[PDB]
Amino acid sequence: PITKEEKQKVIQEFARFPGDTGSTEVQVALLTLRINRLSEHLKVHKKDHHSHRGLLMMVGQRRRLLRYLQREDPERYRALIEKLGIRG
Amino acid sequence: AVKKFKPYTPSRRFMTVADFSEITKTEPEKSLVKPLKKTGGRNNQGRITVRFRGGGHKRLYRIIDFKRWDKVGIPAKVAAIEYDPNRSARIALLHYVDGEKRYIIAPDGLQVGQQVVAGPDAPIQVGNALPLRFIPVGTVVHAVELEPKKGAKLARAAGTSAQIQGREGDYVILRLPSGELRKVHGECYATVGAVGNADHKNIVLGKAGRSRWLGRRPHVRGAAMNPVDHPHGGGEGRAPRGRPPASPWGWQTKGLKTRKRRKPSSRFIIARRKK
RNA sequence: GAGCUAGCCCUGGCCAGGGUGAAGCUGGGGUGAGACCCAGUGGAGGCCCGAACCGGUGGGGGAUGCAAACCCCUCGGAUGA
RNA sequence: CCCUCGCCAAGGAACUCUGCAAGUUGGCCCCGUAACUUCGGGAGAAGGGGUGCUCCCUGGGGUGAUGAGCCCCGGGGAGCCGCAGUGAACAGGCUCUGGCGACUGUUUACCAAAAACACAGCUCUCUGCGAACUCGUAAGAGGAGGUAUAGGGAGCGACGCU
RNA sequence: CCUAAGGUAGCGAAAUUCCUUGUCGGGUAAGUUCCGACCUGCACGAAAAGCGUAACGACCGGAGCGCUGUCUCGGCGAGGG
RNA sequence: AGCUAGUUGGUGGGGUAAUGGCCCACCAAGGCGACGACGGGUAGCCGGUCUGAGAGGAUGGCCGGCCACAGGGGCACUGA
RNA sequence: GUGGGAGAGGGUGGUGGAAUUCCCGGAGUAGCGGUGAAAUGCGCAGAUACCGGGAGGAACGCCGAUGGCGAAGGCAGCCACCUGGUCCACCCGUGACGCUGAGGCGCGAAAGCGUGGGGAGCAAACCGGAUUAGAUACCCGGGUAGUCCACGCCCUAAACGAUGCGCGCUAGGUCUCUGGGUCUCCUGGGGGCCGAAGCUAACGCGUUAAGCGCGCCGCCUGGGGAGUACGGCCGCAAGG
RNA sequence: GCCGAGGGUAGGGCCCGUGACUGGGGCGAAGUCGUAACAAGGUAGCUGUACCGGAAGGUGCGGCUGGAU
């Protein structure tokens, strides 16, 4: 799995203010994290169709926030997806 | 893998070629090659004694190590994996820490840069050689000797494997590539693993010319000949066989057994093959 | 008797010029990543047209011949078994 | 009269076993191109336009030096002549529709080139290796310095559905 | 009644159909050939493979356009005899 | 289910009472489409008429308005 | 976010025993098998029944449940790794970021197809024996695809709860699974039964609505012809 | 001299009428054969698919209850 420690760094490098967990920024960043791992899991386990739905939900989930974030502060949108390397 | 071609010529449409991905060295090791005397299928009398042979690509013969009990306890690194025109299987260049270089036929799974060793003490891992008695019952093995120190004779073609079944005194029990069940002496060396290049059989030659490159001339059917030439010869128009299908020499060719019955190795074959 | 002819073995040599444009690769697009689509590059093939060279489809001539199998026109293959 | 060749009013295959033979078409450039299809093809499908020469204007490239010159690949305009401009020579006639063989190949040197042989591909069958099988009285060889994803024998003959 | 068992799919007047120029349809002014059908298949039929199949063929059929001394139907001319 | 070479726009001219690719030359790579382009089918449109509780449905002969045509097409001349 | 939970949810790799079959050694004799009764079949060339050895494949008994999980198809020995959904408590973070969803994309039981393996049991086709008027069946003896594995296709169903998703509101009793509490019981989330009001043509539904309401989607418009034809797209074919 | 009604050559697209023969469909009916479904319909039914059979159908595999007891 992802570990507690491994996850905090993500929470820590994306937080808007000192105490932050779960702002759009952190939210996307946390999601980008599980996504990219599942992607690599399915790369090997091509027959794990059930967990692909998970992936498609997460990919769907992150997508809807990015639209929110891109709507409110465009300057901030392009900032997060650069640090995360996301568009395609 | 196997590489297909787009149908840009009529013959390309079906032709498939080997993938050659496991190859890391495109040149044979000079001090281990020697010239192949092509025979054309003709013997020292000059007579064709195996019909329809000749005119294939020139080949340099790679000297292979079918002994390996030659160097017990001296390990070697896998330096490369090479193409050998004289077999279905691929070959592995070993650099012994001894400094000496040898070829063996390449097992499946072998890695460029790994190490292998032969002897009573070798770990049971891919590429090692041991007398059959020290390989655990049930593990699959290749390059098996038939009598001790006589050389590896069995399981040498691409993708093949023999498997150890059980033991009985001085002898172990092998299931050969053909499914036959045989006793082989326990001092017969063998190499753990199966032979590589298993995708070999899925190769579609593709056109007459490919066979020609392989040194295989066209085969002419008996039915297309005359009675002087062949049992199936002659007749006006096409004709059925009109007798039990026979070879050019007259023996029965559909079903008839030919192994010598009183052959001494009979005491050692448990079950004749299958399928 | 294989200095003709047939097959094979060893070692050399030869195939004007033009055309078509496979994979691959690079860039662009696409997607979660892909599959894939497009462009350029590329130069594959018992691929195409056609000399040499190897043949011998049709027709005509020849028929005590130029010739005990030739001549003319035409036609098949021409990187390949 | 014969051979080899040239032309021909009107007709245009009515010739004949058969358009046999001979006309036609013919190179390059541009436009354009159907059924069907294994998506490659079918395709040079078909069909049509252009083609010489003179003058004026201009574009890219090679060797120079970045320029002159020399050489290569073009674009645009206006004009001249003849029956006719790949003006001579070399250089496809086309289409529709069945049979047979999938295809390139091979064959009766010297009456048959094919629907015949071969062919990739499919199946049956033999062979545990001093293999089977083949040649040889034998020795010795081929098989194979190969080892059942390998080797022999036989039938069928891409591929699809069987 | 008989057999070891009684020809399945597909195809069929066929490189196979004797009677035969079978019958009907198409094409032609007129078609013993050709194409499409029918089926009492003299005597198809499933690896001596069955029914199809794009591409290919100096293979063998049938038709049309183009164009012609092939023909009506022959004429003149050249050169070697 | 994709359509488009006068095609979509620019410039310069031609043309008319007058705008305009209406027409020509040059230049740019554009214009239209599921809010249905393109294509096929059908119909001249309206005031109104008919029916219907209304909403709606059906319709456009007579009469009034507009359009289009004058054997089938093309073209101009005279002329406000 | 933090901290916890239950589960045949999914993928990979291993591994355990029961049983069937075949082979081998033993010992043993005249029958075994099967049905309604029989025959086919197997058996003195030594079967069945019994003991020991071995080979191989498929499916997991008890637990097991009116249970659990998944969006659906579906998922059951056990072990490890990789991975998804989901509930709970705290009320810590973001601040309407939501709902639905024409096209699109993916998943999708069985059978079926392609290439290669594997093949113990079972078993379309097929053979034989019975039954019968006939028996191209039902019953019995045999038996090939297939059923299993890998990769790639097909995309259908009584693919069902014959019930699209989300949200809010409208009595309760009881049984069960799974979190949390102040552990009588209270509170959440799933799985059944009976029932308030109401709905319904009736049957029945009823806080898991088929009730009272809003949003968006898909769908219906007499039976047959017909899920056919033609066109179109998809597929190797079957065919969708 | 350009454009130009249209005439002519060549190849394509949609539609309509028609065709030896052929595929099933509707109706007719007083015909032949069997009895598949409705009762446990005398082998519970239906189902997608696959193979087979004169015909309804049968059987395999999986599914549903819209199955008596």
Ligand SMILES: [Mg+2]
């Ligand atoms: Mg999520």
Ligand SMILES: [Mg+2]
């Ligand atoms: Mg975005």
Ligand SMILES: [Mg+2]
């Ligand atoms: Mg490989």
Ligand SMILES: [Mg+2]
């Ligand atoms: Mg290929």
Ligand SMILES: [Mg+2]
């Ligand atoms: Mg290729």
Ligand SMILES: [Mg+2]
């Ligand atoms: Mg390819």
Ligand SMILES: [Mg+2]
């Ligand atoms: Mg080709």
Ligand SMILES: [Mg+2]
């Ligand atoms: Mg081909």
Ligand SMILES: [Mg+2]
């Ligand atoms: Mg190979």
Ligand SMILES: [Mg+2]
């Ligand atoms: Mg190869």
Ligand SMILES: [Mg+2]
């Ligand atoms: Mg390789």
Ligand SMILES: [Mg+2]
């Ligand atoms: Mg040397």
Ligand SMILES: [Mg+2]
């Ligand atoms: Mg040698």
Ligand SMILES: [Mg+2]
């Ligand atoms: Mg010698």
Ligand SMILES: [Mg+2]
């Ligand atoms: Mg000699």
Ligand SMILES: [Mg+2]
């Ligand atoms: Mg031989």
